[PDB]
Amino acid sequence: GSHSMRYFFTSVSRPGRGEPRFIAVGYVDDTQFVRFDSDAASQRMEPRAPWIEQEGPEYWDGETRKVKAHSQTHRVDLGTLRGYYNQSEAGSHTVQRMYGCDVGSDWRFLRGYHQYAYDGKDYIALKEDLRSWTAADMAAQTTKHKWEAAHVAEQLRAYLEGTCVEWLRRYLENGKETLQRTDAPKTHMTHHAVSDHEATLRCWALSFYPAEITLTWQRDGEDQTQDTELVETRPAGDGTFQKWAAVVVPSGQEQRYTCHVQHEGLPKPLTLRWEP
C-alpha cells in the first residue's frame, strides 16, 4: 500500500514574557516517530519509535539544529503577522505548518505538500505542482512575494520529491517489522434494545493499523446510510486504531442488516451479521 512522511509544527505566542510554545512532531504513516517540545528539559529532537533509535548522533544533531531554527522562524513570524494584521501585543496567536510527501505502493513519489496557517485559518500553501503558492489574503500575498524572490518553492520541491522520499524509504525499511505490517481490524457486533420496537446494532473494528478504514451498512443487500451513526476513528494508545458504525433497526428485523469492513490488512470481503 501507500505511505507518507509528514511533519507538524505549532507555535503559540506568550505575549507577556518569553518565546513561543513550540511543538513539533513527525509521522511515518500513522506512527509518530520524533518530537520536539520547547517546554521539555532536553531541548533535543527526541525519538518516539524504536526503529528511529538506529540513527546516530549526527542525525540527532542535524534534526535538533533544524527544529530549533524552525522555532526561531516562527518566533519572528508571529511578530511579522501581528503587524500585517494590526493586532495588539496583548493576545496569544498561533502559527501552524505541515509538510510532507506521499508515495504509492511502489514507494515512488506521488505528491508533496507544504501548508501554513495563522490563527487556524489558511494563510499560504504550495500548489500541487510544487512550483507556485496559494495565498489566501493580502498579508499572505506579501509573504508569497518574499518567498518567490527568495526561490523557496524550488528548495521545497527538491526536498519533497527527493529527500523526503528517500528518508521515507529508509524508515520503512529500517522499521519494516511494524511499519510494513498491516493489522487487520478485529470485528464484532453488539445489539442494544431501546424499546420493544427499536434496537441498535453496532459494528466494531478494533486493533487495526493503518488508521484508514471503511465501515458500511447494507439492508437486504442495498447501501443504508439513513439511521446510521459512525464515530471518528480513534487511537487506542498502543499504536492501533478503533472505529464503530451503528444502525437503528425495527426489533425482530436484525437479520436484514449487514456490516461491511474494508481495510488494507483484509485481502477479502469482511461481512458481519447479527445471527446471534
Binding site: Y7, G26, Y59, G62, E63, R65, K66, V67, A69, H70, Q72, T73, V76, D77, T80, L81, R97, Y99, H114, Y116, Y123, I124, T143, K146, W147, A150, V152, Q155, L156, Y159, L160, T163, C164, W167
Partner: peptide, 10 residues
C-alpha cells in the same frame, strides 16, 4: 528527516 536548513520567514 526534516526540510532544512530553516524555513524562510513569512
Amino acid at each position: 528527516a526534516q526540510w532544512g536548513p530553516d524555513p524562510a520567514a513569512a
